[PDB]
């Protein structure tokens, strides 16, 4: 149950920067075992690859597996990913500074994104720190 680089290259066939996107995706899924690459229709408009799953976020002495979806545009890594928190039936989205009504994530890291200094490993690192202070979702009481 693991994705081969070959399968990843096929998923980004229509991408403008393929090797770069594959390279970073491999890095991300290797370090974050709970994120999985999936080719899906973005908003039912067009196919793009995204990293789906959870990232470990420590909050008040406990670690939570926050559900997220990182959409890699066909311009990745030159343009930042479009990121969303994805609440399950047992939780709700906490709208605030870094999360809007739709669960879309907003971070300075994304706003000033610039290749090659900016990357997914850096972005996820930021999310763990930022969400650790302000969770993007909470379990339903």
């Amino acid at each position: 149950s693991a994705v081969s680089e070959s399968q990843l290259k096929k998923m980004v066939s229509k991408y403008k920067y393929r090797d770069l996107t594959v390279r970073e995706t491999v890095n991300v899924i290797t370090l974050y075992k709970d994120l999985k690459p999936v080719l899906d229709s973005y908003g039912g408009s067009r196919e793009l690859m995204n990293l789906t799953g959870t990232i470990p976020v420590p909050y008040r002495g406990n670690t939570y597996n926050i559900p997220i979806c990182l959409w890699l545009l066909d311009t990745y890594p030159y343009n930042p990913p479009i990121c969303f928190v994805k609440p399950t039936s047992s939780m709700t989205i906490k709208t605030g500074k870094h999360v809007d009504a739709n669960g879309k994530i907003y971070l300075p890291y994304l706003h000033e994104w610039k290749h090659p200094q900016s990357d997914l490993l850096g972005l996820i690192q930021v999310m763990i720190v930022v969400f650790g202070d302000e969770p993007p979702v909470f379990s339903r009481p």
Partner: peptide, 9 residues
């Protein structure tokens, strides 16, 4: 890992 979130505060 199974999606988890902190209790509402």
């Amino acid at each position: 890992p199974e999606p988890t979130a902190p209790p509402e505060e």
